[PDB]
Amino acid sequence: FDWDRPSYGYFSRAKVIQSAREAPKKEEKVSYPDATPGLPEDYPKPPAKYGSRFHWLE
Amino acid sequence: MLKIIFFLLFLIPFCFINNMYWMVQIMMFFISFIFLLMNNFMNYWSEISYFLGCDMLSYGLILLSLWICSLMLLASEMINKHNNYKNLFLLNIIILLLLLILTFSSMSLFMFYLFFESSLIPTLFLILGWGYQPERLQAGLYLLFYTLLVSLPMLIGIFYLMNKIGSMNFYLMNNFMFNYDLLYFCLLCAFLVKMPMFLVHLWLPKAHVEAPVSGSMILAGIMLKLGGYGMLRVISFLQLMNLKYSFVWISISLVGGVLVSLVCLRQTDLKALIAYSSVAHMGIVLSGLLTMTYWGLCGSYTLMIAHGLCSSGLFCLANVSYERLGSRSMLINKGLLNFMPSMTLWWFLLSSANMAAPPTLNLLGEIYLLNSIVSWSWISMILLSFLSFFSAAYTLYLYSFSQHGKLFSGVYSFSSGKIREYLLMLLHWLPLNLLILKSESFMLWL
């Protein structure tokens, strides 16, 4: 049959093929519109109204 | 108002410089004069400064303290005579006075409590530091632990009021009326202790008998009033709850006053007898206060001023006698009219004031509490007659027994009365009369 024995390490290599299935898996990213929001850095921070407001404003 | 506070603070260093004992009182008397000029107060708060105001109620109580705390220095000249840690002693009073001024001048309920108790520790040092008898320990704890045991639960009642009112300021609190039974007991059982009430007075005869002369002044002079002053601010928003349990307090104090008067008659100690006399009158003050009527409130404020000056006055005289005779028992102290006849005059006037004798400011207040109580219920005439009758029964026994009879036999020679003592007695009694002229101011705090 005019065939040849492949080299010893022939089949241990990475084998890259042309996928006939033609359906490589897709890629997506989960979305949580309801995530716990935090204070954004762009938010302006004016002085507190009457300061600490603790007991006698201290 | 800060004028007073910063004046006192910068007088603190005078405790450290030597030979400044007498220069202190003058600064303490002079500030009273300066404070005496700034009376333009009203029912509402005035002279705001960062949290310190003063109305007519707070003014009289503050001015009472400055006067009394100034007389403490005159009375306790023995501390200066023996250099018995006088510098530390001075610092105790200057600190103590500041706590009082803040306590009455505080505009928010939390502050009042903050300096309410904080004044106690300077008093506690005073008893242990300069008391003679060994029992100042066993009387040092009673003063500290009766107060702390009932003041710590009050702290919870204060915080529970923020979460409803949102603030401590007294004016904003009056807009509310609370219905919770326990809260009533967490803001009055703490002041009923310090009045004191008859059944929880067990600390008062021990603290007063053992404390030094100066400690007796302030204990009888201002500490019994902080309980009274506190109530006047916190029955405003306990009106509804006050009606369900007032009859318990009125009965106890009224019956408590009578029973204590009999206990007074069976005493044999000057310090004890005067101290038990404090519970007797303080029973009428509390009784009229809880009546909540216009008269019972104005009268109670008046009598607290008058009684403090008197009971503080009577503690001077016991110290004078004790200093020489060396014993505070009635049996030792007899016939002092024949040793110190000039002294016996002051014994009478201060004694007479204690039994609601005219024209003293004491009779003005006592007429009023009596009116409110009678209006509260005609059944109150029974003991209110007994209590006023026996309130003179022991006063005569106190005065007559100690001044009239034949002299003691074993007494050794001792000095006669000094000018300092006479001047001390005048300043106690003489305002107690002249104040009647301008009761306009020290009465109508409502």
Side-chain angles (χ1 to χ4, degrees):
Chain A
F1 315 84
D2 307 348
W3 295 335
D4 314 327
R5 192 177 187 277
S7 169
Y8 70 103
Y10 175 73
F11 300 97
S12 294
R13 298 153 174 281
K15 307 196 172 303
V16 70
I17 55 158
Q18 182 56 58
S19 176
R21 187 187 69 179
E22 300 283 350
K25 295 309 307 308
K26 79 198 290 184
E27 191 204 19
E28 55 267 44
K29 204 170 211 178
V30 187
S31 293
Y32 295 90
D34 315 327
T36 53
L39 202 70
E41 267 192 353
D42 54 14
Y43 205 105
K45 305 180 184 179
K49 224 177 185 170
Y50 317 100
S52 179
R53 286 188 310 276
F54 196 37
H55 289 250
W56 64 109
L57 174 51
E58 295 295 328
Chain B
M1 175 55 73
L2 299 176
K3 300 144 152 181
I4 302 302
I5 299 303
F6 284 111
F7 189 99
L8 271 293
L9 294 174
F10 284 53
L11 196 66
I12 297 169
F14 278 38
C15 303
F16 311 135
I17 302 176
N18 77 282
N19 291 350
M20 281 295 219
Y21 185 92
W22 296 125
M23 291 334 307
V24 164
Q25 54 187 349
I26 293 146
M27 298 273 95
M28 291 205 48
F29 269 116
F30 181 79
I31 188 54
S32 299
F33 178 81
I34 300 309
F35 188 66
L36 197 70
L37 312 187
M38 44 186 268
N39 173 326
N40 59 344
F41 304 100
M42 281 285 327
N43 58 338
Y44 66 93
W45 290 95
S46 306
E47 292 83 3
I48 309 309
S49 66
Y50 303 89
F51 57 85
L52 300 169
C54 189
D55 65 350
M56 192 85 267
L57 169 56
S58 291
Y59 174 76
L61 286 154
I62 287 168
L63 178 51
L64 167 57
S65 79
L66 289 160
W67 198 250
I68 287 297
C69 294
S70 190
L71 298 187
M72 293 177 70
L73 307 177
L74 275 174
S76 50
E77 188 269 355
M78 194 277 303
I79 300 306
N80 192 6
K81 183 173 179 182
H82 299 152
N83 58 87
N84 181 12
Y85 300 109
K86 60 200 279 189
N87 295 324
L88 178 63
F89 174 73
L90 276 154
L91 170 58
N92 203 2
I93 287 158
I94 301 301
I95 294 290
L96 177 60
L97 174 50
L98 277 163
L99 277 296
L100 297 178
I101 303 296
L102 299 162
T103 299
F104 298 117
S105 181
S106 283
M107 294 177 71
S108 76
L109 177 54
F110 169 53
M111 299 275 178
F112 163 74
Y113 171 85
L114 175 54
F115 308 119
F116 181 76
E117 64 83 26
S118 299
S119 58
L120 192 148
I121 296 88
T123 57
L124 187 56
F125 300 155
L126 212 67
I127 290 163
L128 311 176
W130 295 265
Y132 316 96
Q133 291 170 353
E135 294 294 328
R136 53 207 153 106
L137 286 165
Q138 189 273 332
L141 304 177
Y142 266 124
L143 166 55
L144 176 54
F145 279 44
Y146 264 77
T147 295
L148 272 176
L149 199 150
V150 305
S151 296
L152 284 170
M154 162 161 41
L155 176 52
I156 300 172
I158 283 167
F159 282 128
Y160 167 80
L161 288 162
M162 279 174 138
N163 316 328
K164 313 312 183 183
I165 297 101
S167 71
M168 294 296 173
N169 168 281
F170 286 116
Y171 200 76
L172 304 176
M173 312 215 68
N174 299 339
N175 209 23
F176 290 76
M177 219 80 75
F178 292 85
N179 307 319
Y180 308 87
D181 294 84
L182 299 178
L183 178 60
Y184 177 89
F185 294 104
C186 308
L187 300 170
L188 289 162
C189 300
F191 299 127
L192 291 163
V193 172
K194 203 163 195 183
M195 272 325 287
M197 180 154 305
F198 154 67
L199 286 181
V200 305
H201 77 292
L202 271 286
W203 67 272
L204 194 72
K206 295 295 196 78
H208 288 223
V209 167
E210 271 85 329
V213 55
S214 60
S216 304
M217 302 204 152
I218 202 72
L219 283 162
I222 301 299
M223 308 298 92
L224 269 48
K225 319 314 169 212
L226 291 165
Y229 169 76
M231 293 180 183
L232 292 159
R233 300 294 197 174
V234 306
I235 55 162
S236 60
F237 57 85
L238 300 174
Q239 312 214 55
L240 168 53
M241 292 288 329
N242 176 277
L243 291 172
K244 308 175 185 154
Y245 310 127
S246 159
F247 74 98
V248 166
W249 307 135
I250 297 300
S251 63
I252 286 159
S253 63
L254 289 170
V255 166
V258 180
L259 303 156
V260 166
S261 306
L262 309 194
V263 165
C264 276
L265 286 166
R266 300 303 307 274
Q267 287 321 279
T268 50
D269 186 74
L270 286 168
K271 284 276 185 65
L273 182 60
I274 293 153
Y276 276 101
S277 174
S278 309
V279 176
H281 297 334
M282 271 295 128
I284 296 305
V285 168
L286 168 56
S287 304
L289 203 164
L290 297 157
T291 309
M292 294 177 71
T293 310
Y294 207 107
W295 291 72
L297 286 151
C298 291
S300 66
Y301 168 48
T302 290
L303 182 46
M304 274 165 30
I305 286 169
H307 169 281
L309 275 165
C310 173
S311 295
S312 49
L314 291 169
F315 277 116
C316 299
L317 295 160
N319 180 39
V320 169
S321 184
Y322 168 84
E323 201 275 359
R324 324 192 185 290
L325 274 287
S327 192
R328 54 171 71 141
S329 77
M330 295 280 277
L331 304 188
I332 298 296
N333 296 320
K334 285 176 174 192
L336 298 171
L337 176 68
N338 306 125
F339 284 134
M340 311 165 44
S342 58
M343 203 86 248
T344 301
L345 172 53
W346 295 124
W347 264 103
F348 193 86
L349 307 187
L350 283 171
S351 292
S352 69
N354 191 82
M355 65 180 288
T360 64
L361 190 67
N362 191 311
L363 183 51
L364 194 65
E366 190 277 331
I367 281 290
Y368 293 158
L369 301 156
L370 188 153
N371 287 358
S372 192
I373 294 157
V374 160
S375 76
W376 188 73
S377 177
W378 73 268
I379 301 297
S380 77
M381 271 155 38
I382 310 314
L383 311 93
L384 199 66
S385 64
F386 276 123
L387 180 41
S388 297
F389 173 87
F390 292 125
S391 278
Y394 68 75
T395 302
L396 279 175
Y397 169 63
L398 167 63
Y399 163 80
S400 72
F401 196 89
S402 76
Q403 306 301 300
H404 153 84
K406 187 159 65 173
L407 297 170
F408 199 66
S409 308
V411 61
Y412 289 102
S413 56
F414 53 84
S415 301
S416 179
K418 319 306 296 299
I419 282 159
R420 182 176 51 74
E421 277 145 1
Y422 302 133
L423 170 58
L424 174 54
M425 296 296 172
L426 177 67
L427 300 177
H428 265 288
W429 164 85
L430 165 54
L432 197 63
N433 284 21
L434 302 168
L435 282 154
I436 196 79
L437 305 172
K438 197 85 166 175
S439 61
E440 293 262 355
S441 193
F442 293 166
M443 183 177 176
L444 310 170
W445 78 274
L446 269 184

